[model samples]
Target: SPTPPYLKWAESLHSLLDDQDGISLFRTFLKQEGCADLLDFWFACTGFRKLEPCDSNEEKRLKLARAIYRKYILDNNGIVSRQTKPATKSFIKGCIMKQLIDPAMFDQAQTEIQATMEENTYPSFLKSDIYLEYTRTGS
Candidate 1:
């Protein structure tokens, strides 16, 4: 399948974050799970808060993004307490910078995060092997 627009943007941002010609910890966090989209939601809720619109297109997008991210991806905290929110917010700020992102705008943080999947939360609801087996058996 062709890559979605968001994924294309994500790929760009991910590459930029890893390639920014200077000294920084940016490259260290380039893993798929470490990308801004998944990381932000994972930090906020650990499956805690529901997303809500705030004010602008920026705020509204953030709200829905987090909501969908949590519902579909962010894992339950399991054992961690609610102390992780601040860290998550900060991490989002650092990675979701305006000038540092793909399109380099003040609010492109939301755009940079459009394709993140919560791979850590749901444990792959549709694994390839399982689906193949089911398809063969007509289950």
Candidate 2:
């Protein structure tokens, strides 16, 4: 007996993701999966995902964001809009925050990122699309 191509690819992909640094943390969160309740409780409270020390690297955050944009934005299937507006905005905002920019420069980038995201907003193919992956290399 032989494995099918998609299944083979999926298994390989699963192995790759499982080895990723934050994947386990994310997996644990998902298994518990109370984000909806958490969000409702903290909607207006000041809260955010802290950038792990490694994420202080600007290049790393952008590289991750670029990969996410390419996977979700560029390669999105044509049938659905494929952009979860709120999630995309949050992704861009979080990416900007992780970059160690000067205060003045950060304000500028913050404004621009928000505006650009507003301009790019759309619906998503998947209802709960999340997680932006980034490699070490920008390209």
Candidate 3:
């Protein structure tokens, strides 16, 4: 059978990036899946990657590392621990102790979470009521 319209839309990561409402729509869908934090975490990594190596500054790097660790890595209430690996978590903890906060710190975890989003969450979101509603209204 042909792919459903919703699935087609869901598969269009390009469109999602191009459309201003894409993030909001995906945000709603991810929240429904209890993985919205993945986006937060992913965006944070992307933002961090743009910086000039947080390791260069003591205060800034520590501050950024603390926030990222609390919000994305160490926090049980964050990023659905099932999406991460044990060794990766351990590595992050190690990095924290040494104040080795860098964009690469979460590279592996970020990729895993993003894959989960694209493979699992995105399909469900495409078929969700929120997506359908948005598509119908062109919102």
Candidate 4:
């Protein structure tokens, strides 16, 4: 049988996340690592970014942003609090205070989480059986 392309997809975390199969596999590993919130926060930010920028949606945007901030950013124990810089946190806090709920409101925090995964967690994921066995068995 041919190799499952997960071998190649594993090269970039971005590519892996682009594939739902890889994302879930990575999600399982991340949860075991006790930082599943990173992916959750990233997903939330993605959904927030996709919100339409209509006047009618502004309140909804603010509500979503505050919820994200409360659940992830405001929580002292979250992976986001540890990974995101103080400046980014301050920026988000100020934006929330002013109700500046831009579609890209969480972009910086999201980028921080992405970079953390790529630089640190992703190497481990690549070496893990999560990636290895999948390609080996083509599941």
Candidate 5:
């Protein structure tokens, strides 16, 4: 049987980001799978990484960095929105505490979430109805 052409996008995260339908459709699927925050968090970190570790928009970068740390790493209420290694969390905590916010701040944390998505959730995503719809409809 010929594989549905859409399945090609599932093979690589890079492919997924490159295709318009990949972002639109995969996001819908992850949202239903109840891990939409991870993808959105990843996007946030990509933008954060582009801040160049410089003083340009230091206030904006600081606010966004703290926001990522608080929302995903460890919140004021002690909630961990996603899985972060203890050492990574401590590094981010110490940096934010010292006000040393920069583009590289969330590098490790984003990689952590990316690992979870690519290694863990990706299989489920491929098996998801959202991904299988084309298979069902013969498109």
Candidate 6:
């Protein structure tokens, strides 16, 4: 079967998905779109996911998750876009109310935001002058 068009180009940009310079470039693009906070929230959630919560560290994990949700996922002041589903929002709110913080709490929102970035923002970034310049100079 022929490779899908998105896969063909998106494969080249896969490094961008994992590289710092690539993330920084995409961050610049995100900021221009007034959505830099999405990346911030995603990174914060990534950090939260890295924790191995036990009875000893569960307290710490919950504390961090609470703070993250308040700052990045709560309404009005939250950084999350409308792409975040209402069901996920309600589930997160319930989890917060119960002081139950887990990496899974951010899964729905994170997945939606990531898909948006990968499908929409990344394609544009691949074709951008910024990417062209980054390629030419290795700067």
**TM-score, model 1 to reference:** 0.22
**Per-residue alpha-carbon lDDT of model 6 for 14-95, expressed as tens digits?**
5565667777877887787787777777777788888886788988888888877677667555547465777877887788
Mind giving the per-residue lDDT tens digits that candidate 5 earns over 27-104? 888778677777888888898888766666888888988888778777533323546678888999999899987667
Winning candidate number (lDDT): 4
Q: Once model 4 is optimally superposed onto the true structure by TM-score, how far is the C-alpha of residue 47 displaced, in angstroms? A: 1.2
lDDT tens string, model 1, 1-139?
A: 8743322323443432332330022222333223433444333432223333234444555544445334423444411212234344344445344312211221222332322322221123123333234334531
Q: Which stretches of candidate 5 lie over 4 Å from their true place?
A: 1-5, 76-80, 134-139
Q: Is candidate 3 or candidate 5 better by lDDT?
A: 5
lDDT of each: 0.33, 0.32, 0.72, 0.87, 0.76, 0.72
What TM-score, computed on C-alpha atoms, does each candidate reach? 0.22, 0.24, 0.79, 0.91, 0.81, 0.81
Please identify which of the two predictions, 1 or 4, would achieve the higher lDDT against the true structure: 4
State the lDDT of candidate 3 residue by residue for 1-139, as single tens digits: 8744444456675456445577788887888777888777877767665667633565776677677777778876666456788788788788888877766787887777778777877777777888888777763
- By TM-score rank, best first, the candidates go 4, 5, 6, 3, 2, 1
Question: For this target, which candidate reaches the highest TM-score against the unseen true structure?
Answer: 4
- Candidate 4's TM-score reads 0.91
lDDT of 1 at 33: 27
Candidate 4 weakest ten by summed lDDT: 3-12
User: Model 5 compared with the native: what TM-score?
Assistant: 0.81
Considering summed lDDT, which 10 consecutive residues are worst modelled in model 2?
38-47
Q: In every candidate, how many clashes are there?
A: 1, 2, 0, 0, 0, 0
Over 38-117, each residue of candidate 2 has an lDDT whose tens digit, in order, gives: 11111111112232335355555455445433433344451111323445445544655565322232233233332332
User: After superposition, which runs of candidate 2 have C-alpha atoms over 4 Å from their true positions?
Assistant: 1-56, 78-83, 86-139
Sorted by lDDT (best first), the order is 4, 5, 3, 6, 1, 2
